Amino acid sequence: GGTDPATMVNNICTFILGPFGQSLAVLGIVAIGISWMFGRASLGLVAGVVGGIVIMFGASFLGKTLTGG
Amino acid sequence: GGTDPATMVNNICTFILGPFGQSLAVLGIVAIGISWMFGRASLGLVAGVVGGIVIMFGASFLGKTLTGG
Amino acid sequence: GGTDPATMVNNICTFILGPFGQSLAVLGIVAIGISWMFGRASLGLVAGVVGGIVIMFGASFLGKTLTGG
Amino acid sequence: GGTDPATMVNNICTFILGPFGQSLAVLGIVAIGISWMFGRASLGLVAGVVGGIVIMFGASFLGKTLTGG
Amino acid sequence: GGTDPATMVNNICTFILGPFGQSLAVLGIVAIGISWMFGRASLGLVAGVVGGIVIMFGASFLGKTLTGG
Amino acid sequence: GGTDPATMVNNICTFILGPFGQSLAVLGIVAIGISWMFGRASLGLVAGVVGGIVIMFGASFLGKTLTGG
Amino acid sequence: GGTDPATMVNNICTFILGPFGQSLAVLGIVAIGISWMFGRASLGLVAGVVGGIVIMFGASFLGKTLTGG
Amino acid sequence: GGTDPATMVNNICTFILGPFGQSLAVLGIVAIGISWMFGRASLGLVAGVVGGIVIMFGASFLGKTLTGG
Amino acid sequence: GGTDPATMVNNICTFILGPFGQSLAVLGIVAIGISWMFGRASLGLVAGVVGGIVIMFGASFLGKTLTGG
Amino acid sequence: GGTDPATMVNNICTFILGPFGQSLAVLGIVAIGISWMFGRASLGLVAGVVGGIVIMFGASFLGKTLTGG
Amino acid sequence: GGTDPATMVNNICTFILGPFGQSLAVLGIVAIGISWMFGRASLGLVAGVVGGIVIMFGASFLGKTLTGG
Amino acid sequence: GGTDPATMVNNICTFILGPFGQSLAVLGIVAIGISWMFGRASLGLVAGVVGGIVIMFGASFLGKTLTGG
Amino acid sequence: GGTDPATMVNNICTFILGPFGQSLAVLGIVAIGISWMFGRASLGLVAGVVGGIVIMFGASFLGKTLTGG
Amino acid sequence: GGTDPATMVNNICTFILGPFGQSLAVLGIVAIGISWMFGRASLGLVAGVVGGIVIMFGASFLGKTLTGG
Amino acid sequence: GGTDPATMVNNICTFILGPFGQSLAVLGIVAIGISWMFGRASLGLVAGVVGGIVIMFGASFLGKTLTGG
Amino acid sequence: GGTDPATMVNNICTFILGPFGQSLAVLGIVAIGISWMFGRASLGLVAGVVGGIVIMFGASFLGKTLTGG
Amino acid sequence: GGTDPATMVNNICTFILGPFGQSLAVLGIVAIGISWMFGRASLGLVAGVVGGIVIMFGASFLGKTLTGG
Amino acid sequence: GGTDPATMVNNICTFILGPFGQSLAVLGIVAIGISWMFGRASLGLVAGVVGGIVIMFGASFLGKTLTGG
Amino acid sequence: GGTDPATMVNNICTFILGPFGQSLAVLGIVAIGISWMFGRASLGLVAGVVGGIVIMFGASFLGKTLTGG
Amino acid sequence: GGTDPATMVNNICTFILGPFGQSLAVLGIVAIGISWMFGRASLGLVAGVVGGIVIMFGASFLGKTLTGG
Ligand SMILES: CCCCCCCCCCCCCC(=O)O[C@@H](COC(=O)CCCCCCCCCC)COP(=O)(O)OCCN
Ligand SMILES: CCCCCCCCCCCCCC(=O)O[C@@H](COC(=O)CCCCCCCCCC)COP(=O)(O)OCCN
Ligand SMILES: CCCCCCCCCCCCCC(=O)O[C@@H](COC(=O)CCCCCCCCCC)COP(=O)(O)OCCN
Ligand SMILES: CCCCCCCCCCCCCC(=O)O[C@@H](COC(=O)CCCCCCCCCC)COP(=O)(O)OCCN
Ligand SMILES: CCCCCCCCCCCCCC(=O)O[C@@H](COC(=O)CCCCCCCCCC)COP(=O)(O)OCCN
Ligand SMILES: CCCCCCCCCCCCCC(=O)O[C@@H](COC(=O)CCCCCCCCCC)COP(=O)(O)OCCN
Ligand SMILES: CCCCCCCCCCCCCC(=O)O[C@@H](COC(=O)CCCCCCCCCC)COP(=O)(O)OCCN
Ligand SMILES: CCCCCCCCCCCCCC(=O)O[C@@H](COC(=O)CCCCCCCCCC)COP(=O)(O)OCCN
Ligand SMILES: CCCCCCCCCCCCCC(=O)O[C@@H](COC(=O)CCCCCCCCCC)COP(=O)(O)OCCN
Ligand SMILES: CCCCCCCCCCCCCC(=O)O[C@@H](COC(=O)CCCCCCCCCC)COP(=O)(O)OCCN
Ligand SMILES: CCCCCCCCCCCCCC(=O)O[C@@H](COC(=O)CCCCCCCCCC)COP(=O)(O)OCCN
Ligand SMILES: CCCCCCCCCCCCCC(=O)O[C@@H](COC(=O)CCCCCCCCCC)COP(=O)(O)OCCN
Ligand SMILES: CCCCCCCCCCCCCC(=O)O[C@@H](COC(=O)CCCCCCCCCC)COP(=O)(O)OCCN
Ligand SMILES: CCCCCCCCCCCCCC(=O)O[C@@H](COC(=O)CCCCCCCCCC)COP(=O)(O)OCCN
Ligand SMILES: CCCCCCCCCCCCCC(=O)O[C@@H](COC(=O)CCCCCCCCCC)COP(=O)(O)OCCN
Ligand SMILES: CCCCCCCCCCCCCC(=O)O[C@@H](COC(=O)CCCCCCCCCC)COP(=O)(O)OCCN
């Protein structure tokens, strides 16, 4: 009978922000560690990646506040 | 039948943080030693590389704490 | 469900200023000691490193005062 | 029914200049402290970062004055 | 009955140069502040962004003068 | 599974302050002896090197006291 | 059929720490001797190069201890 | 009568990982040597190329482990 | 009738490592000599170039050992 | 019909090591003389430049011996 | 077919420690003699240069003993 | 309706040369004092900084005179 | 009815070289003053910026002379 | 009745090389001046732009000579 | 809502010249005492450091007088 | 009656490798000279261009050897 | 009727190496003089620029010799 | 109708070597005087700057002689 | 309409050699007096500074005579 | 048509060793005289400068003998 998109998109968000996003952020941190190992350590890389993680896990509240509710 | 990404990404993390990351850090230390041999010894290089190794092997707990759980 | 960045950034600050920053400052002092052992002892190095440590552990109050509250 | 951008952009500014910018400036100060610890202490780094913080928290009045009102 | 484009384009200009452009310039200044915080402070970035703001808010007079009237 | 940096940095400190720092200080004393043999004996060299050794082996308590705890 | 990286990286480490690293350290010592011949003899150069050699040949145990095992 | 793709793709993998991949890796090493000869020697190039070779010859086990079997 | 790539790539390697690579290394040594003549003599340049030559002429054995055979 | 690179690179080497390299070394010696005239006379400059000249004119035999033939 | 670096680096060491290093040490002694002729005779210069020569010609045994074998 | 850049740039100049430049020069003087406290007192630093302040507060008349009006 | 580009480009030049370029040069001088305040005073910066200003305000005569009329 | 392209293309060339190209070159010089004001002064920019102007105003003779007449 | 830089820079000055600068000057005096203890007592060091302290605590009035108000 | 492509492609090769390629290489050398005049002299540019010329004039023998005949 | 490229490319070379290259080299020498006036005098700049001029005016003979005729 | 570059480059040279280069050299001499006033007087600075001026005003004859005519 | 650089550079020279250079020389003399007060009186300092002043105020005639007119 | 570098470099050498080097050595002798007038007379300065002059005017024979012909 199909389901309304208000539940399918919410399922997508719950999946991408549940246990999957945790391991994705872990992989991001592993990536910045490896990039510091072989090369140069610059604050820009860590700042950008930590900001990306914050934006990923703040998407809910960022969307709630940016749209006035 | 395929497997859910919650296990595949975890397998990736376990591989990259198991016996492989050990030898990768060993190669990083060999690299900083060689860079000190032919050239100048600066605290910046060792600080950056040791920090990269710490970030690589702290990725799990860093991810657990940075996301509030 | 995600967490608001006002808590994630605070967690980052608490981690980087808790038991980790203590050992990081200890490593900085070990570094200045080693740099005095093999080489020349200059007030500039110790002044800069102690100032860096003070700025690291004063970041909270420095931010509170520099922004007028 | 949607909201006019004159309120959404203002919400963005209020969020980025409220409790979030405080901790962001705190992280910037932690960064300059860490950069002074492992390396050399130069007035350029602190000048640039403090100027960045001032520009971030002066954005409102800087915009009001630069546009003649 | 529709409206002539001489009023619709003027409405677009008035909207984009009224209260919206103010907050947009505020966001630009916040952006340059954040870019100075985590990274390097270069006169090029501030020069370019302030020039962009000037060109945005000078568009009316720039258009009046560049076309001889 | 990785380890939290609060243990890795502590391991670094324990290694650099255990049996390794002893022989490093021994090498420093050998160095000042050799520098006195072929050349001039100045109180500045011995003062600086002994101060470096004290700072290396006082790093723990110096860090505990400089940070108020 | 290919080989798992846990053996290839180990082969790299064994090669770089076997008979090759010996002659590389010999070349480093020849380099510091030549640098002392034509120029000035400073404890900093020898300290840095011997430390680089120690870090190169201690990479295995340094990696074992820095990672808690 | 044709053959099932489960054998054709396996033939492709066996060819690309047999005696051909050996000489391809040899060419990669020749390339990094030539790039070090005329230019600057950076750890990034060698790290990237050796990692590419490891990924090429670890493709089998990497695929076996990343897919949980 | 064409030839299998296992012979063409081998021909490429034999050409690039035969009499051509000798004169290429000779040109590299001429280059480092000229760079020492007009400018400053740094161990880094010679170390990097000699390492590049070694990697070029060790490509065969490096490939044989890095791949476990 | 073109010529094989084994002759073109050899022509390059013969040109750069024939009558041209002689006058280039003469210019290098003129340079070190001028640098001693207006400034300070340090053994490092002459050592580096004479070593550069030796490496330039020893490139042939250095290449023959460094490659085992 | 190329040669393994274990022989090329050994060839480098044999060349730099054979008949070439003898004349290089002779030039070093000529240098210290000339520096004593026009100027002041200090034990530091001779000590440093003789130590450099000893380190150059002791590189083999110094490397054998410093690495425990 | 926007404002002509002849007023916006003038507003920028008035802001940067009004009460803000005073405190900026005060910070510059504090900086040179701190640099004299921990380190060496050289006329070059004070000369450069006082010249920078003079150029900052002479920008108006310097621009008027350098352009012939 | 539109205007010929020979007048529009001339209007652009007159605007960019009239009262706007004056304040732009004033901002450039403020910039070099600020760069001298927090940092090092080098003749290169002032030379480059004054040359840029001269080229900006000499564009007319430079164009007249470079094109033979 | 239309005109032959041998006159229309010539009209295009005369327009683009008459009074219009003069002011275009003036704008180019203003551009290089502004680029030197806010940023770094490099010979490459001025060389490229002056070469572009020369090529623009030499197009006639360059075309006459490149085509043998 | 942010604060105007005329108050933030003033807060910076008040902090750096309040109770913090007192203890900083105390540390400077301790430094000159320690430098006199182990070494030679020269009027230059004390003159420079006392002048640095005077410039630090005279920054306000020095700025008021150097700028004509 | 047309000609077989085995002669037309050979004519193309003979033209592009006859008297035309000579002047093309001459233009390439003029280009690298001009690029060294206005800018920085880097071994990479000359190495790349000389390698391009060698590959252009070695195309015949490179094709003969790469294809096993 | 068109002309064969063997004459057009030769015309290009004759133009770029005739009276134009003379004044281009004159401009290069003016450039190195100006770069020595405002800044530091380094042998590298003059060496690179004179080498660029030599390569520009040696392009003919360099091409004749590098291609074996 | 455009002008041939043989006249435009000559105009550039005449401008840069006419009354402009005189005042540029005057500014260079003022610069070396100011650098001697606040700082240390070293023969290297004056030698380099006078050599730069000589090279600037000798560019014509230097170009005539370096190119054999 | 802009002004030719022959007047702008002359304005720069007139400003830097008018009433400004007088007070700059006065500051230089104050500097040498202060340097004699706290420290040692050496003829080298006064000779260098008076020579710097002479070169600053002789720049015009020095430029006129050094260039043959 | 260009000239071969074997004549251009020879022209450079003839110019730098003809009537120009004579006056350059005269300036060097004037420099050592002035340095003896205001300051201390040390054999090191005269030895170094006379050696620089000898090396400048012996460059031809030094190059002929150092290269075995
Ligand atoms: C647009 C706004 C600009 C604001 C800038 C004001 C900054 C003033 C600080 C002057 C710093 C000067 C740099 C310097 O020179 O290093 C000095 C520092 O040491 C100290 O005192 C360290 C203690 C300072 C702690 C102060 C805390 C500020 C927090 C500010 C939020 C050591 O000498 P190092 O020996 O220099 O010698 C190496 C040669 N390179
Ligand atoms: C078309 C219009 C153009 C307008 C441009 C005017 C901008 C003038 C600002 C000159 C900035 C110069 C950059 C620089 O050089 O960094 C300096 C800055 O520090 C400060 O003073 C920070 C305090 C400045 C706060 C001023 C606020 C402006 C708001 C403007 C709305 C530090 O030195 P960093 O040490 O340079 O050294 C690294 C080497 N790269
Ligand atoms: C066919 C007609 C062509 C006309 C073109 C004339 C345009 C001239 C403007 C030269 C712009 C040059 C670009 C540049 O280079 O950026 C500069 C600009 O900054 C400024 O001055 C900004 C203030 C300019 C405000 C001028 C307003 C023009 C309105 C024109 C209607 C900053 O440096 P960014 O640091 O470059 O460094 C990044 C490296 N990529
Ligand atoms: C986030 C974590 C950060 C951890 C950083 C701790 C590192 C502490 C090491 C301090 C190094 C300081 C650098 C320095 O200054 O060089 C010194 C070194 O010499 C030595 O002792 C060499 C022996 C050290 C061996 C120690 C082995 C560490 C392994 C660590 C896994 C020589 O003087 P060089 O004379 O400086 O003078 C040139 C001026 N540039
Ligand atoms: C949705 C899932 C996402 C998963 C992504 C995880 C990947 C993590 C690997 C981080 C790679 C970071 C890239 C990088 O930055 O290059 C580094 C790499 O070198 C290495 O360590 C090479 C050894 C790595 C071998 C690891 C094998 C993974 C197999 C995975 C199946 C070198 O530095 P190059 O010097 O960067 O500098 C050029 C500037 N551009
Ligand atoms: C995922 C796997 C990653 C594996 C990476 C391991 C690589 C370790 C090699 C560390 C290389 C460090 C680079 C470096 O820093 O250059 C050094 C090198 O010189 C040498 O010893 C050259 C001899 C090395 C020969 C070793 C042969 C490896 C073959 C490997 C198959 C010179 O100093 P240059 O002076 O740096 O200074 C310029 C500042 N940029
Ligand atoms: C992975 C392999 C690595 C191999 C590296 C071995 C290289 C050993 C050569 C040590 C060079 C050390 C550099 C140095 O330091 O310069 C010295 C050199 O002078 C000489 O002896 C010149 C004569 C050397 C001729 C030797 C010929 C090698 C050919 C090799 C094919 C001068 O002092 P400059 O005074 O330093 O002071 C400036 C401060 N920067
Ligand atoms: C992390 C590990 C650190 C290890 C460091 C130990 C090194 C100890 C050597 C102390 C060297 C001190 C330097 C110094 O000061 O120079 C002295 C040297 O002379 C000698 O004895 C030369 C004979 C030494 C031969 C010893 C061979 C070591 C091999 C080591 C493999 C001369 O005086 P120069 O007169 O100083 O005066 C100029 C003022 N700058
Ligand atoms: C194409 C045109 C070129 C024009 C260039 C003329 C510039 C002449 C100024 C020479 C500056 C020389 C730089 C220098 O060397 O710093 C000196 C400066 O101090 C002063 O006098 C500061 C007072 C100068 C105020 C003059 C105001 C000019 C406005 C110009 C509009 C300090 O010594 P710092 O001790 O050098 O030592 C560090 C070693 N790096
Ligand atoms: C195909 C034709 C090519 C023509 C090119 C001729 C250009 C010659 C100008 C040489 C410029 C050299 C660049 C340079 O090097 O910067 C110098 C410039 O300063 C000045 O004199 C500025 C005054 C020049 C005003 C001259 C006006 C030309 C108008 C031309 C129409 C400062 O040093 P910055 O300190 O370099 O140090 C940073 C390290 N990157
Ligand atoms: C099949 C035929 C091919 C023919 C090609 C010959 C072209 C040779 C011209 C070499 C151009 C090289 C490009 C370059 O590199 O830019 C240089 C140019 O400057 C100049 O001399 C400008 C003056 C040249 C005027 C010459 C007029 C040619 C007319 C030709 C009709 C500046 O350096 P920019 O600093 O590079 O640095 C940025 C890094 N990207
Ligand atoms: C373009 C404008 C240029 C202006 C420059 C004028 C500066 C004149 C000050 C001369 C300073 C000379 C430097 C020097 O030489 O140090 C002296 C200083 O001591 C003092 O008197 C300290 C008390 C001075 C307090 C004066 C306050 C100025 C505020 C100015 C706003 C100590 O000797 P140190 O023993 O030198 O010996 C080490 C060898 N290196
Ligand atoms: C599936 C098969 C794959 C085969 C690939 C093998 C190719 C190996 C050639 C490695 C080329 C590496 C590229 C490079 O990096 O440029 C180098 C090249 O210079 C040279 O040696 C030029 C001389 C080479 C002549 C060799 C002739 C091959 C014919 C082959 C038929 C210069 O440095 P540029 O300075 O890089 O710096 C710019 C940063 N981008
Ligand atoms: C696959 C084939 C590869 C062939 C490559 C051989 C090239 C050898 C030339 C080595 C060039 C090295 C580059 C370099 O390093 O610049 C040197 C050059 O100066 C000179 O001698 C200029 C005179 C050279 C004239 C030689 C003419 C070759 C024609 C060749 C046809 C200056 O120092 P700059 O001071 O480096 O310092 C800046 C730091 N970046
Ligand atoms: C492939 C060809 C290579 C050709 C290169 C030959 C160049 C020889 C010139 C040696 C220059 C050496 C550089 C140097 O070292 O600076 C010296 C220069 O002073 C002078 O004599 C200036 C007078 C020279 C005028 C000579 C005119 C050449 C025209 C050439 C056309 C000053 O000392 P600065 O004190 O060094 O100290 C700072 C430490 N960095
Ligand atoms: C890899 C090969 C290495 C070869 C190096 C051999 C070089 C030997 C020359 C030793 C030079 C030692 C330097 C020195 O120390 O300066 C001495 C020089 O004076 C002279 O005799 C000048 C006359 C020498 C003329 C000799 C001509 C060599 C040509 C060589 C082609 C003066 O004393 P300055 O008083 O030192 O005091 C300042 C404190 N810094």
Numbering used by the authors:
A (entry chain a), B (entry chain b), C (entry chain T), D (entry chain S), E (entry chain R), F (entry chain U), ...: 5 to 73
From the paper:
To extend the comparison between the archaeal mating pili and the existing structures of bacterial ones, we used cryo-EM to solve the structure of the A. tumefaciens T-pilus encoded by the pTiC58 plasmid to 3.5 Å resolution. The T-pilus has a fivefold rotational symmetry with a rise of 13.7 Å and a twist of 32.5° per subunit. The 3.5 Å resolution of the T-pilus map allowed for unambiguous model building and interpretation of the protein subunit, VirB2. The atomic model of VirB2 shows clear structural homology to the TraA subunit of the F-pilus. One clear difference between VirB2 on the one hand, and TraA of pED208 on the other, is that there are kinks in helix 1 and 3 of the VirB2 subunit, produced by Pro23 and Phe61, respectively. Similar to other bacterial conjugation pili, there is a stoichiometry of one lipid molecule to each protein subunit. The same analysis applied to VirB2 T-pili revealed a strikingly different set of PLA2-resistant lipids, with >65% of the phospholipids being phosphatidyl-ethanolamine (PE). The electrostatic surface for the lumen of the T-pilus generated by the atomic model is overall quite positive. While the lumen of other bacterial mating pili may have evolved to be optimal for DNA transport, the lumen of the T-pilus, also used for the transport of a diverse range of other substrates, has a positive electrostatic potential that would still allow DNA transfer, but not be optimal due to the greater friction resulting from DNA sticking to the walls. Surprisingly, the cryo-EM structure of VirB2 reveals no cyclization of the pilin.
